[PDB]
């Protein structure tokens, strides 16, 4: 559409930072649910200022929205500094967007004498701070929006000049499945996260359990036949109860799925102090819903330990090595983790999973994509034992006698020995043998060395080694 191009802007900050306050300060001074403003573009143009009541909401609102977040603005109170939340908000941002702008709000609490040179204190700190972040170059704008406080605008048009500058470069695809994030509610006003629309289309409301029809839609001047991704319009629909859903998920019917467990693609956050231990609970926020699952990790094999990153699929045919801790720091190019939730969460496919750090350093740990969402409540009795997690369990024994040239004796294995008979075994010398208390080994081909070496020579290390493959869920196994 030649007129009215839209881009979403994530407004980030602390619970008392002035985020919600800077919107109105921008919208109001536009050219004279969510707020926004307009302006020409020398490639109209409107930018909805994403916001929310608090944090948790503003997070869950930015994760599943990532694919539509075009740029992140960072609000800061030029007195408190860079408060707690103002830090988490800065990484999640790094995950979703690709650029950001940092503004110093409340630029009225500084005395004129010590302000311009106290401003630079943070401008320096922020700059240096961002040096270790993909938002490494983010410009900074000192600005005071409500110069008095609650009851009682500074350099706002300036903040608009910048906002548009980095607001360049967008791309949107309508081919996906429909997804709209409701922020107003019978009418429904939200933002389109995935897919395309058209009058007469069918829409689902998983919160209410039903599919309604799009009687009409209206955004700014009424015309509307179809919307694309990133747009922000309102879907007029059946006079259902506009109360049960004042902010929720709407999409194509049968488009979402309810998941009891999922195979994410894992990736620790650098700034995460600590390890990533299999079986370590977490606070997972998947798409737009935060459910507490558990983890498990696993990795590829050494042969293709550096295979390309397949970030959209899953090559379920090949096997995978079990890992007790995320290998951080030759290494792997990426790894995964069979999440297992407590509550039947329910959300998109390939949705941007994130979740970490439950406890009584930063609180965020990793982030990943959802490459597969198990839907059966019995993912253990159905899909699970079929998986191929290689659990390399080793053993070692010591060789002693030499019955013949095709026989030896061993004694180890901390046993049963009637359930392992036949497994391919290898002596400390290099020859191969087939395990045929006590022991009974065979050998096709003994070697020349061990043949020379009761017994004789004092057995300078007749060592016996074993290596068998243990798929995590099958009953017992082989190797090769
Ligand atoms: N002193 C002062 N306070 C400001 C100024 N601008 C905004 N605020 C404060 O911003 C607070 C609201 O924060 P807000 O971002 O709406 O919180 P949220 O809506 O929970 O994110 C109000 O209580 C104001 O006191 C300002 O210019 N000077």
Author numbering: 2 to 33, 52 to 62, 85 to 193, 199 to 231, 239 to 382, 405 to 435, 441 to 494, 498 to 519, ...
Sentences reproduced from the published study:
Instead, the cotranslational insertion of Sec into a nascent selenoprotein is promoted by a specialized elongation factor, eEFSec in eukaryotes and SelB in prokaryotes. eEFSec is a translational GTPase that binds Sec-tRNASec with high affinity and stringent specificity, and plays a pivotal role during decoding by delivering Sec-tRNASec to the site of translation in response to a particular in-frame UGA codon. Human eEFSec adopts a chalice-like structure composed of four domains: the N-terminal D1 (residues 1–215), D2 (residues 224–304), D3 (residues 310–455), and the C-terminal D4 (residues 477–575). The height of the chalice is ∼100 Å, while its width is variable; it is the largest at the cup (60 Å), significantly smaller at the foot (30 Å), and the smallest at the stem (20 Å). The N-terminal D1–3 folds into an EF-Tu-like structure (see below) harbouring the GTPase site and the putative Sec-binding pocket. A detailed comparison with a myriad of translation GTPases acting on the ribosome reveals that human eEFSec is a structural chimera of the general translation elongation (EF-Tu/eEF1A) and initiation (IF2/eIF5B) protein factors.
The isomorphous orthorhombic crystals of eEFSec:GDPNP and eEFSec:GDPCP diffracted X-rays to 3.4 and 2.7 Å, respectively, while the monoclinic crystals of eEFSec:GDP diffracted X-rays to 3.3 Å. The asymmetric unit in each crystal form contained either a head-to-head (eEFSec:GDPCP, eEFSec:GDPNP) or a head-to-tail dimer (eEFSec:GDP). Even more unexpected was the finding that the GTP-to-GDP exchange induces ∼26° swing of the C-terminal domain D4 away from the predicted tRNA-binding site, which results in >15 Å translation of the entire domain. D1 and D2 ratchet slightly in the opposite directions: D1 moves towards the ventral side (that is, the tRNA-binding face) of the molecule, while D2 rotates the other way. The domain movements, which are most noticeable when the molecule is viewed from the side, cause the GTPase site to relax and the Sec-binding pocket to constrict. The binding of GDP to eEFSec causes disorder in switch 1 and slight repositioning of switch 2 further away from the nucleotide, which yields a more open conformation of the GTPase site in the GDP-bound state. In particular, a segment of switch 1 that harbours Thr48 is ordered in the GTP-bound state as it provides the lid over the pocket accommodating the γ-phosphate. By contrast, this segment is disordered in the GDP complex. As a result, Asp92 and His96 point away from the GTPase site and are not properly oriented for Mg2+ coordination and GTP binding, respectively. This explains why Mg2+ is not present in eEFSec:GDP even though the sample contained 5 mM MgCl2 during purification and crystallization trials.
